[PDB]
Nucleic acid binder design. Structure first.
Lengths: 141, 57, 185, 124
RNA sequence: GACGGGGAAUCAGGGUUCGAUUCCGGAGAGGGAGCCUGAGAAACGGCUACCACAUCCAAGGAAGGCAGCAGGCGCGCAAAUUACCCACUCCCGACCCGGGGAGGUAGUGACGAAAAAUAACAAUACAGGACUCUUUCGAGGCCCUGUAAUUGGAAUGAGUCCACUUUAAAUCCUUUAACGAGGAUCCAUUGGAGGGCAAGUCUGGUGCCAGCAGCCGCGGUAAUUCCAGCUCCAAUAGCGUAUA
């Protein structure tokens, strides 16, 4: 520290508060902007309705297409873009089918070579995608 | 071909073979007993770098 | 408002490094040597010895000729002598820090049955403890994690209701005798 | 071949009863019923086996020990006065009304429904 | 996105975050307002005025407030039986004697915490290991150490099933009859095998396609990273993912 007086606690406190406000994580966690602009709104999982299935491309050093869906939310109705994880699971998703989206790994940040997608799907038609992969459960009919 | 970016293409075209029928593996305490056995008390003093259990070169 | 307890705590601690060679080999060696089930038991014994060592260091931090230091040091020393992992010659507080985890694993009931001579192997000792064949002072024990005392080591013996210690024969022996009497008459 | 020992035996002149913690030894056998326990407590106390009340027998692990409580009275009516009614029903000397709480509460609300001598009439 | 506090998590020492939540105190019964009785209420399982909402109706009127116990709708990632009893603990009344969704009991219950089965013994199978030796060949292998769908005997547990015990009556635990296991089919899963970070340059298929990958990166017609089998590594009735 710099201020080393015996009767100095206030300058230390106010300077520590100001330099704590001059941060990124403490600025993010204590303002209403970073939660008001958050699509999940401080929630881990969310439900939604798929409207379109759009394949977005990869980044520079690798070449692929990435299978994604356009999901509108139920609680606030905004439009996000999810990402179906596994191989060949887009055939289980039909128009206007309810899904369960979740986080993608880096706390509201784009992960890997997929540009601009921060969410991924876990369950579709109120059954898990893993059980549809492993041949354990069947979609209701 | 059909098309380029088909979903489930490789796994759909992958040859389908099943499991091989085998006995059950020892689970619980005897799994650790066999692990300690094979790892420690059935060794010989070799030289050089040790070989991994999955070395099949 | 309901009348319950709501008091509980963990007895084991997970180490910070999940995958490195030496501590994994040391724990696996201890599991194989004393015939335990999993790593949670040796982690539990390490947790108990860590709490005892922390209490001993807290007592050794406080200066000599104090009432609470002498009281808690004599209480912990008497308990640690009576549990069987210390000696009356080593009746000092600064020797608590020199203990190792194998000394705490010595007074387990499974290895005590194995070292007394009531079972062939230590795994045979564990499947003898889990089987309810022995007793400690006219009362059977089923749990292999039964820590014993210095005055309780001599009194361990087979139970009354056991074919090994004299009693009713078991199910398979009675089934074979019934098969023999059926084949004979 | 079962034996009974006594522990914490004390008398109450102000409750006209004797209280003790009994110890039951039944090795190689299941838990003995309360009637034989009552008859043995009647034997060693020189008492008729009607004022003998035992309760709460918990069995230890391993077999051989069971800790219970015993209650010793002097006469029948003095036993009948200061007794819980469920032990009298277990002995067979008391009978409680057999109806459930829901229809009692609904019938109480039906007495609340009207006023007068017909309050007894509406509850049948 | 504040009920406060006693507290909780994490913790060398200093600290950071949470505290709706059973104990204490405060506030309210849709929201403001007014009042009777009573010692003590601005009481709402008391009354009265408003609006929002809402039940029945011969259309004149009448009757309400589950943020109590169960339960329903809505909401959302998210949360249980329209069960039994005052026997245990207390409270109230004229009162030993009546009442108590306060409470206790059971069911649902992988929030979480503690304990703990899924094997062991004996001999043959076939390789080594310590002792004078046979330079190295057989051997005591009596003293071991191990695993290969080799065999045979000792054992009890889940579950079925009398009784007893417990309890207001049960149920659960324990005691306990008669039953109840050789591949003991009574069959242990979850995430991985390039580095971080324990563990294949094994085999077959696609060929910057499918896809994997928290990061670096991997796929271009020989993939140590994809899709499948075998082997194995980590925790173990538990493991993985997303969030503060």
């Amino acid at each position: 520290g710099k201020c080393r007086g015996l009767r100095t606690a206030r300058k230390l406190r106010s300077h520590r508060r100001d330099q704590k406000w001059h941060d990124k994580q403490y600025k993010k966690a204590h303002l209403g902007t970073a939660l008001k602009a958050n699509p999940f709104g401080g929630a881990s999982h969310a439900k939604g309705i798929v409207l379109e299935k759009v394949g977005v491309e990869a980044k520079q050093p690798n070449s692929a297409i990435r299978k994604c869906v356009r999901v509108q939310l139920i609680k606030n109705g905004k439009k996000i873009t999810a990402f179906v994880p596994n191989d060949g699971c887009l055939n289980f998703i039909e128009e206007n089918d309810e899904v369960l989206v979740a986080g993608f790994g880096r706390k509201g940040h784009a992960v890997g070579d997929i540009p601009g997608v921060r969410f991924k799907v876990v369950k579709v038609a109120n059954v898990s995608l893993l059980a549809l992969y492993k041949g354990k459960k069947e979609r209701p009919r | 071909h059909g098309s380029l970016a088909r979903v489930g293409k490789v796994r759909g075209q992958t040859l389908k073979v099943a499991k091989q029928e085998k006995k059950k593996k020892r689970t619980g305490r005897a799994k650790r007993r066999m692990q300690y056995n094979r790892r420690f008390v059935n060794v010989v003093p070799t030289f050089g770098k040790k070989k991994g259990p999955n070395a099949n070169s | 408002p309901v009348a319950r307890s709501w008091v509980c705590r963990k007895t084991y601690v997970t180490p910070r490094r999940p995958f490195e060679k030496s501590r994994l080999d040391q724990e696996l060696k201890l599991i194989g040597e004393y015939g335990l089930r999993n790593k949670r038991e040796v982690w539990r014994v390490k947790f108990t010895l860590a709490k005892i060592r922390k209490a001993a260091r807290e007592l050794l931090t406080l200066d000599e000729k104090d009432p609470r230091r002498l009281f808690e040091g004599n209480a912990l020393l008497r308990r640690l002598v009576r549990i069987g992992v210390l000696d009356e010659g080593k009746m000092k507080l600064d020797y608590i820090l020199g203990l190792k985890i194998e000394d705490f694993l010595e007074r387990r009931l499974q290895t005590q049955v194995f070292k007394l001579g009531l079972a062939k192997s230590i795994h045979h000792a564990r499947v003898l403890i889990r089987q309810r064949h022995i007793r400690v002072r006219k009362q059977v024990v089923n749990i292999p994690s039964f820590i014993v005392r210095l005055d309780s080591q001599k009194h361990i013996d087979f139970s009354l209701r056991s074919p090994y210690g004299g009693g009713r024969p078991g199910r398979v022996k009675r089934k074979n005798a019934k098969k023999g009497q059926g084949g004979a008459g | 071949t079962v034996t009974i020992r006594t522990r914490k035996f004390m008398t109450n002149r102000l409750l006209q009863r004797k209280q003790m913690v009994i110890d039951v030894l039944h090795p190689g056998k299941a838990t003995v019923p309360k009637t034989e326990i009552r008859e043995k407590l009647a034997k060693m106390y020189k008492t008729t086996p009607d004022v003998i009340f035992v309760f709460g027998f918990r069995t230890h692990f391993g077999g051989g020990k069971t800790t219970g409580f015993g209650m010793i009275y002097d006469s029948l009516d003095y036993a009948k006065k200061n007794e819980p009614k469920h032990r009298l029903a277990r002995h067979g000397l008391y009978e409680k009304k057999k109806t459930s709480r829901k229809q009692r509460k609904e019938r109480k609300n039906r007495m609340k429904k009207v006023r007068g001598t017909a309050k007894a009439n509406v509850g049948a």
